[PDB]
Amino acid sequence: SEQSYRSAGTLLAQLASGETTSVALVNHYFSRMAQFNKPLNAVVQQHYALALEAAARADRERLEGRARGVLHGLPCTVKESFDVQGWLTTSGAHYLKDNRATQDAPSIARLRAAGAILMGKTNVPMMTADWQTYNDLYGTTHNLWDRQRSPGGSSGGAAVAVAADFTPVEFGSDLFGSLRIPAHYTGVYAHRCSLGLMSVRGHVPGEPDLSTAGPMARSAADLRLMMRALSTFWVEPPRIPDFSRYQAKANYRVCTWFSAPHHEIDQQIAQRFQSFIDKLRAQPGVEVDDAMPADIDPDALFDIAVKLSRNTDKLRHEYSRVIETLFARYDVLLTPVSPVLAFAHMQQPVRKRKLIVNGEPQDYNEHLFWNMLATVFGLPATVYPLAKTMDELPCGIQIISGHFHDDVTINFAEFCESISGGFTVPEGYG
């Protein structure tokens, strides 16, 4: 099979029905990386021989009725900073250029046990500590929509690989937007899981207290499929998210938070959000309120975020109660991921890095402002690609909900797919 941009869900169906095999899929993805990865520099380790062997095994198992696992026979790549047994985990640092993992990171092991075929790893900035993706070991990852621009970071290689169909899904860590920001800039879906829903151990730098992890994909159903594979609670659940299937709702009540004093977004995002909200407000049973609680001072929360990045705790626990009541009244909260769309590479020292909002220079740390909320309170957040004209860059929206409401945000993204937005194939790719 040579068809490009099939979803994981479709691919699993076609494996079951014999319209494709795992060997044909591994050859598809490595073929696309041969044809397209050089100018993008998204996949920085390739393990073809191991992947082809694993695919042959999956195919034998399928034929003999011995296939097991919800990802059985599905190839993928993972973020370079997660341990895969026998593979290098450099995190783009010279000090670790020959650091090879002894065992899988626990979430990697859980993809492998679901039957995923790991074909390689995708680029990260050094120690995954930036909102761009570049390092001295592997080079810069370029945004496939405009290669003079960054796909963001730290999961930038993963977002580009998904958007180029080098892989149907990806898996990465998210501290302050590490998964969400590259999804926004690059036009793919991402889900950062609730704190405690899945292990982030076996990550370099990397059970961490703020970092979570989750999938990238090109549909909401594929995000849900990954979470079926990945979820292993290590906190006591306040409730059990249901990842079994899309659960459609008759009523949605949505909160928006698109600006704060001194934290404005570019008018282009503002108009594209407004156009999306207009369509959402026109749906039966849907209310959309501009109802961010004023109880949460954004500057106070930013100061907490800056500190984390007996007194702060006091405020943090009080704000977490304001969020619980918020998500008893609203199903989801929609916010920006960044105040800008994808920018040209900025590898100067941090201090000199600017984001141009409505013509004015703004702080690079606006990335932290628009991602601290889910990070600080351990919340789930799905990033959903909005529509784009061929003359527009990708733009995502961040769908947040209460702790262990991961099913709610992913279900909300699938409902949005019926309204506006979704994955768009970049011009020049399959």
Numbering used by the authors: 2 to 207, 215 to 317, 368 to 488
Q: Please, what does the article write about this entry?
A:
Colibactin is a genotoxic natural product produced by select commensal bacteria in the human gut microbiota. An amidase, ClbL, plays a key role in the pathway, catalyzing the final step in the formation of the pseudodimeric scaffold. ClbL couples α-aminoketone and β-ketothioester intermediates attached to separate carrier domains on the NRPS–PKS assembly. ClbL is a member of the diverse amidase superfamily (AS) of enzymes that are characterized by a highly conserved Ser–cis-Ser–Lys catalytic triad that is key to amide hydrolysis.
ClbL crystallized as a homodimer (space group C121) and a single polypeptide chain consists of 487 residues. Interpretable electron density for residues 318–367 and 208–214 is missing, suggesting flexible loop regions adjacent to and covering the active site. The overall structure displays a compact mixed α/β fold consisting of 12 α-helices and 12 β-strands. Compared with other members of the AS superfamily, a notable structural feature of ClbL is the presence of several disordered regions around the active site. A lack of electron density is evident in both monomers of the asymmetric unit, suggesting that the disordered loops are relevant to the protein in solution. The protein crystallized in an active conformation, as is evident from the covalent conjugation of an unanticipated small molecule to Ser179 in the active site. PMSF, which is present in the ClbL purification steps, models well into the orphan electron density. Electron density corresponding to the phenyl group is not clear, suggesting disorder/nonspecific interactions. Both O atoms of the sulfonate group make hydrogen-bonding interactions with the side-chain hydroxyl of Ser155 and the cis-amide N atom of Ser155.
